[PDB]
Amino acid sequence: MQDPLADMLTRIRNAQMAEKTVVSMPSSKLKAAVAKVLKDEGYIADFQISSEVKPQLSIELKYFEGKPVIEEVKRISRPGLRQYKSVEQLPKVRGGLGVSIVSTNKGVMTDRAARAAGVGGEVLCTVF
Amino acid sequence: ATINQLVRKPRKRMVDKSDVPALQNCPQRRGVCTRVYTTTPKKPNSALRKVCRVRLTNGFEVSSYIGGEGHNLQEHSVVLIRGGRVKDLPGVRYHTVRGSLDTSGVKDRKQGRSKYGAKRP
RNA sequence: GAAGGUGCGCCGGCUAGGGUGAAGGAUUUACUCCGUAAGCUCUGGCUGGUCGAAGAUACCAGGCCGCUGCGACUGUUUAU
RNA sequence: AGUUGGUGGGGUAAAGGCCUACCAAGGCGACGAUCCGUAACUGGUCUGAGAGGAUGAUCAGUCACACUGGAACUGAGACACGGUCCAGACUCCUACGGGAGGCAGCAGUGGGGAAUAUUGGACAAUGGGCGAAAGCCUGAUCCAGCCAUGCCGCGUGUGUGAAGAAGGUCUUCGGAUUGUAAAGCACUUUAAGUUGGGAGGAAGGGCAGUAAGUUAAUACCUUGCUGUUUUGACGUUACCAACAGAAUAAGCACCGGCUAACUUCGUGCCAGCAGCCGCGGUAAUACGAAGGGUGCAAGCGUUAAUCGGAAUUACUGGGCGUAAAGCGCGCGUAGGUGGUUCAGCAAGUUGGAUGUGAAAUCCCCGGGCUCAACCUGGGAACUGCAUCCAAAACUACUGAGCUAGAGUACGGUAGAGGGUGGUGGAAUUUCCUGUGUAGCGGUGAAAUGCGUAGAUAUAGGAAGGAACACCAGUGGCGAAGGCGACCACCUGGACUGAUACUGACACUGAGGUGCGAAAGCGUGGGGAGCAAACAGGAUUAGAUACCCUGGUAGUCCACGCCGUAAACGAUGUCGACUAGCCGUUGGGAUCCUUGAGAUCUUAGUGGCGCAGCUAACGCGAUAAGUCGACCGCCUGGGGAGUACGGCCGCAAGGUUAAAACUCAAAUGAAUUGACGGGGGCCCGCACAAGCGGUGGAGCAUGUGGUUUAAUUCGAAGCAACGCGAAGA
RNA sequence: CCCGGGCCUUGUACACACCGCCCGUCACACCAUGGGAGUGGGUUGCUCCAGAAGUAGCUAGUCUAACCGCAAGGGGGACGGUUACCACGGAGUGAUUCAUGACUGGGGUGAAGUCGUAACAAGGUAGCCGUAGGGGAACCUGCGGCUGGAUC
Numbered sequence A: 001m002q003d004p005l006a007d008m009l010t011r012i013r014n015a016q017m018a019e020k021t022v023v024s025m026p027s028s029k030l031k032a033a034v035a036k037v038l039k040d041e042g043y044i045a046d047f048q049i050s051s052e053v054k055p056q057l058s059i060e061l062k063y064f065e066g067k068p069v070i071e072e073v074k075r076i077s078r079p080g081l082r083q084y085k086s087v088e089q090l091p092k093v094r095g096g097l098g099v100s101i102v103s104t105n106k107g108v109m110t111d112r113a114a115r116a117a118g119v120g121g122e123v124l125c126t127v128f
Numbered sequence B: 001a002t003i004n005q006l007v008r009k010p011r012k013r014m015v016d017k018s019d020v021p022a023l024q025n026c027p028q029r030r031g032v033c034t035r036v037y038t039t040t041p042k043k044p045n046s047a048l049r050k051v052c053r054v055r056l057t058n059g060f061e062v063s064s065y066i067g068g069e070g071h072n073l074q075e076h077s078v079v080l081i082r083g084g085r086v087k088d089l090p091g092v093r094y095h096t097v098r099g100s101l102d103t104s105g106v107k108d109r110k111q112g113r114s115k116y117g118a119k120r121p
Numbered sequence C: 001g002a003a004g005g006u007g008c009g010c011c012g013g014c015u016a017g018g019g020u021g022a023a024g025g026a027u028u029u030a031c032u033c034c035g036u037a038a039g040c041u042c043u044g045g046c047u048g049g050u051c052g053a054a055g056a057u058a059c060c061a062g063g064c065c066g067c068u069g070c071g072a073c074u075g076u077u078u079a080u
Numbered sequence D: 001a002g003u004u005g006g007u008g009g010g011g012u013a014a015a016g017g018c019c020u021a022c023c024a025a026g027g028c029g030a031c032g033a034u035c036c037g038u039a040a041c042u043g044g045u046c047u048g049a050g051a052g053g054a055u056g057a058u059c060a061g062u063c064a065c066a067c068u069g070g071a072a073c074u075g076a077g078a079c080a081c082g083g084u085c086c087a088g089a090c091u092c093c094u095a096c097g098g099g100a101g102g103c104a105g106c107a108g109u110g111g112g113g114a115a116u117a118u119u120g121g122a123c124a125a126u127g128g129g130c131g132a133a134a135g136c137c138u139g140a141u142c143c144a145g146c147c148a149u150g151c152c153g154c155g156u157g158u159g160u161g162a163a164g165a166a167g168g169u170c171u172u173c174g175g176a177u178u179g180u181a182a183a184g185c186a187c188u189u190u191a192a193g194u195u196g197g198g199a200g201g202a203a204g205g206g207c208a209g210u211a212a213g214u215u216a217a218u219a220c221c222u223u224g225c226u227g228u229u230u231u232g233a234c235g236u237u238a239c240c241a242a243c244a245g246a247a248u249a250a251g252c253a254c255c256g257g258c259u260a261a262c263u264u265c266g267u268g269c270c271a272g273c274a275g276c277c278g279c280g281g282u283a284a285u286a287c288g289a290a291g292g293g294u295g296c297a298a299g300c301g302u303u304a305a306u307c308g309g310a311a312u313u314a315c316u317g318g319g320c321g322u323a324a325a326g327c328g329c330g331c332g333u334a335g336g337u338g339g340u341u342c343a344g345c346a347a348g349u350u351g352g353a354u355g356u357g358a359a360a361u362c363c364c365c366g367g368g369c370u371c372a373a374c375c376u377g378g379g380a381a382c383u384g385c386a387u388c389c390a391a392a393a394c395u396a397c398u399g400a401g402c403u404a405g406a407g408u409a410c411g412g413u414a415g416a417g418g419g420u421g422g423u424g425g426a427a428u429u430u431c432c433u434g435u436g437u438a439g440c441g442g443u444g445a446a447a448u449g450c451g452u453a454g455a456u457a458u459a460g461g462a463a464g465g466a467a468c469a470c471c472a473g474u475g476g477c478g479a480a481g482g483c484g485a486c487c488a489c490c491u492g493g494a495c496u497g498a499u500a501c502u503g504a505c506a507c508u509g510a511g512g513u514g515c516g517a518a519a520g521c522g523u524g525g526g527g528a529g530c531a532a533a534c535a536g537g538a539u540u541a542g543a544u545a546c547c548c549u550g551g552u553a554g555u556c557c558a559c560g561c562c563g564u565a566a567a568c569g570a571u572g573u574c575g576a577c578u579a580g581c582c583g584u585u586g587g588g589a590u591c592c593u594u595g596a597g598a599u600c601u602u603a604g605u606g607g608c609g610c611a612g613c614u615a616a617c618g619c620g621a622u623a624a625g626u627c628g629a630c631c632g633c634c635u636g637g638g639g640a641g642u643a644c645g646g647c648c649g650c651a652a653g654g655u656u657a658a659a660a661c662u663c664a665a666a667u668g669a670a671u672u673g674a675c676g677g678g679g680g681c682c683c684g685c686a687c688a689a690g691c692g693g694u695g696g697a698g699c700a701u702g703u704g705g706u707u708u709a710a711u712u713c714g715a716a717g718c719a720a721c722g723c724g725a726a727g728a
Numbered sequence E: 001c002c003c004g005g006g007c008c009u010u011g012u013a014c015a016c017a018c019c020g021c022c023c024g025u026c027a028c029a030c031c032a033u034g035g036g037a038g039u040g041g042g043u044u045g046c047u048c049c050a051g052a053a054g055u056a057g058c059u060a061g062u063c064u065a066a067c068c069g070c071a072a073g074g075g076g077g078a079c080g081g082u083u084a085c086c087a088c089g090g091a092g093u094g095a096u097u098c099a100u101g102a103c104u105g106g107g108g109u110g111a112a113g114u115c116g117u118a119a120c121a122a123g124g125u126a127g128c129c130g131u132a133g134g135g136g137a138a139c140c141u142g143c144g145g146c147u148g149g150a151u152c
C-alpha cells in the first residue's frame, strides 16, 4: 500500500518459509531493479517482467540444501524513516558475507560496489 | 514507540529522589540530639537499637542510628550524621559517625576500628 | 457606582464634524426634490498661557468594606 | 496599543518605534507565545562499546556584576571594582553644625558550614602602564609557606638461615600453624641526616672604542661589533660526590553467598551486624575478641553525587490477549505517510573543492625532565555550518499520462439496521357476574398473607400496561452501544454481475466533533408483571442477607441531561503475503439443463490444524506468523485513578491528573502435592440389619484436680488414662 | 446417607498445605498527607501619588575673561527659576508561593485486642464490572454486562 518495495521482500520471505518455487507481484522500476541486484548476486535464480499494461514481476527461487539461500531479508529505508548513508557509513551485513542493497546515483547496486564506486545513497534492504 | 510519536514527545527519564534529603548533597551534616531512645525492629529481628533524634544545621529533624556497643550521648549533644539507612528500623535513614564531636568511639574495639572511631592501642 | 484613582476655572492658537440655510440646479409639474455662501446653532480634538489656599468652588449632590442570623426577591401590615 | 507597520521630523559614531507627531489595526502564539521555578553560556569534564546520559571546578573565549537603586561627566574607548553626583541600609569620627568608607583585588579576620591555605619574598624572568633613556610601580606574574586533596615515582632493606628456637592459636593430643618467618651469619644502604662541590632559568644595562646610516658637518643621534663592570626573588637551586649506621619509616578494610579469604573462645533474638539475601532465641566460618588468611598499602574504608551495569524511556535497542499498557466506538482538522509510467528541476540525497569550525584538552607518532605524573613539536579530529561545482537511483516539487487503490452510473439479493404510526395473539393483574365450598398461597418445614363479608378453582364479560412463545440457528444486520410480533410510510448501509465513467481523488489521525448498555437526573404522561428502598414472617448465637409474603422509586412513552461498564475478542485502523481439512449465511460462475447434487470464486460467520510465534496457556487467512503507514497507551506494588486546580454536569459525578510516605516484592503462565459443604468408580462392623454392652448402680484399676512432708518420674485425641509396672 | 481410605478428572488466591488463606469496621500507638475559621512571611501584577541628583527644553531674573565693539554695550556663557524624564518612598486592590491553625477526613505501618467471616473449592447465596439504594463492618439488594464460574 504505502511501501511497495517492502512488499517485494516480504513476498519473497514468506515464500521461502513455505518452500514455494515462484512468486508473482506487480512490477516497478525499483522492484525490477532490486531483482537485478539479487539475481546478479545469486540469491534469486532469475526474474522476468511480463510486459503488459499491468506488468507482473516473477521470481523463481533458489534452495541449496532445502534451506532457502536467503536466510534473512530485512527492509531498512522504510517510508516512515528513510535512511541515507555515506560511502564510509554503508552497512556491512554479517561482516561482508551478506549484501546491503543501496540505491546510489549510479543506479541500484550493492554496498560492495558502492564503496568501490565511492558513492552513497539510500540503504534499501539487507540480505543474507 | 513509533518514531513519529517519539519526535513530538521524547523519551522521559525519571530522576530518583535521594534517600538522604536532610543531608542536602553533602557527605555529612552537624546536628544536636533532641531525644535519645531505643526502638524495636520489624518482624524477624528483636533488639533494642539506640536511635537519637537530631536537629540538623539546616533545620531538618531526623533520627539516625547509633552504631557500636554503648554510647555516651544524651540530650543537647553535638553529633555528625552520615548517610545509609537501617533496614529493620522503620524511619531511620542516617548513621551517626562515632569518633567526631561529642559521640566518642566505642570502648575496647579492636577490629574495624576506623568505621567506629576507635583509637589504636 | 464594588473598592480605588486621574482630570475639571478662565483666556488664547490650530483643527474636525451636526443641523438649518439666499443662491443656483433639477421635476424650471409645485405646500416638489437636490443643494447652498454668509449668518445662527450643537458636538468635539490637539496644544499653550494664566489666577487663586482652593475651579464638580455656592445651592445641589452615594460614605465604604469584612464576617454572621432571619426572610428568597418587588410588595403588605398594628390610622394614633 | 509604541504595541505592529507607514509618512514627516528629531536622535545615534551607525540602521532601527531609538524618540516623537499623524494615519492604519496591526504584531506574536500548540512549530508553545505569555507566565512560574531554576540557571551564567561555550571549548570542554565525568561516565559509556557506541548512541547517549550527567555536568559547566582548575585553564581558555564571551557575558553580567562591583555595598543596594539610579544618573550622567570626562575620555578614542565607561555609564567606570580600588572615578564623580544623589537616594537608601550598615560601620566609624565629631566641637552636633557636618563628614568618611565599600577586600565578589592579594594576604588576613569574625561568621556560616562536613569542608578548602601565609597578615611571605621579588620585580630576577615574561607581560602591562609611564618615560627619549636611565629608571619607577605592578598581591599581573615568578616563586616560596600549609594541607596524602588528587595523579605519579621512591623507600621503610638484601641473601643465607631448621632450632622447623620461644610464645600464641588450633588440636585428632600424634601433631599442625604462625614459620626462613624470627634468632643468628654475612651484605648493601635509595630516600632521610651531615659535609663538600655545583649548572641553568640572564634577555640586558652602564661606560669606552670602532664600523655603518643621517646631515653642510668629523658634532649630536640610531644600529652592528669589541673590551670592562654590573642584574637571580626563589635558593641555603636542580644536580654531583664523601661519612655513618639497617640503622629513621606499616597501616587500613574484609573472610556466609554475591566476593578473594576460617577456626576457637565469650554472648545467647540480649549484646549487636547489616549494600541485598539475611545472622544472632546455649556447639554462630554472618555478633565481640584471639589466632590464621585475604585484598590494598602511605594509604585504607564510610558517606555524598554522576554515569554504567539498566535492553529499567529501548534512535541504536523494549513492550500492550492473560504479567503495566488498544481510547467504548465512528467521522474528521493540523500533521505523518502515500499505487504506476515518461520528462524536467535539484531542496533532500551522494562525491569533491573552498571558507570557517579560536587556543588548550581527547587521540596518533616523536622530543625533554634519571622514568612517570608533567611539558612540548607535528598530525589527526572538531561527526557542524555556509558557498560553489558535478550526478539524477529514491524522496520532495513541476508538467503530462495509466488503472491495480478509491469512487460513481445500472439490475438484483438478504437482513431483529434506524425512525414514525397503526394492528394481532398468548399470558399476567384488577374489576363485574354465575356455579361451588373449606381451604388457597408459600416453604426444607413453617409463618406473615388471602379466605365463611364465600377465597382458590371454574365459566362469561370488561379495562389496562408490558414483552413479543414456536420460527430461532458459534443465524442476520449495525462503526460500536445495540436491534427479535405483523403491516404501511420515511430512510442508511452491505453483498452481488457485467459493462460504462473519474483517474490516486488514498490511509491514519493529536486537537475537535458525533453516537454511546444499564443505572441515574429533570419536565410531563403511564403503570399489568417485576422490584432497589421500606414493612412483616422465617432461619440463625446474631441476620440491617440468602428464603417467603407485600411493596415505592424504577423498569414503559416523549423531550432534555449524564457519558460511564468485564463498553471484552480483555486483541486500534488500513494494505499485502503464508499448507490444508470440516460446517454455515448472502450471492455469482461451470459441470447436471437434471428431477438434483458436485467443482471453483466472493463477502461474512465458526471448529481443527502444517509452518511460524509465544514465558506458557494458546494464536494460527477472522494471526497473537512475515511485513508496511499512522495513532493511542505502559515503565514495580500500595498510596491512587485518590488529593489539589481546570473543564464539563441540575445533581450523582465524569474527565485531566500528582506528591509525601511505605514495601521488597506485587504479577502472569504452568508443575507436584494438599484441600473442596466439585464430579466419576471402589473398599473397611464406615454405614444399613441384628447380637451384647458403656453412660444409671456397688466394687477393682489408672488418670486429672485437690491435699500432703512426699503423695517419685514419665506417658496426654484417635495413636495417654488395667500405659512403662509381667504384680509399692 | 455418617466416618476413614484407594484411583481418575476438575477448581484453587492453600504449600505451616482448610486446624490453610484472608477481608473490613471498631480500640491503642507512630508516621506522612488532604480539608479548615483563620494567623504570620516571601515574591509579584495593576491603578495612582511622589520626584533627590542628573540630562534636555523654556527663560521671573542675577552675574560674566577670550569674540565684536562706539569702548555705551552686544554675541555667547554661567548661575537662578521653571517644565519633561526618573530612583527612593507612599496608597489602594489583586495574584501566587511558603509556614503555621482549633477541629476534621482518609492513607500507611505496627508485638497483637473486639465484632463478624466478605473473597479463594459451586468458599457453602458463583464471582467481578458500571450504577443506584440500604446497612456497625467486611458487605447486601435491584438493573444491565462479562467469564477472569463449579457440576452437567
Ligand SMILES: [Mg+2]
Binding pocket: C069
Ligand atoms: Mg447568633
Ligand SMILES: [Mg+2]
Binding pocket: C071
Ligand atoms: Mg422580606
Ligand SMILES: [Mg+2]
Binding pocket: C078
Ligand atoms: Mg402604630
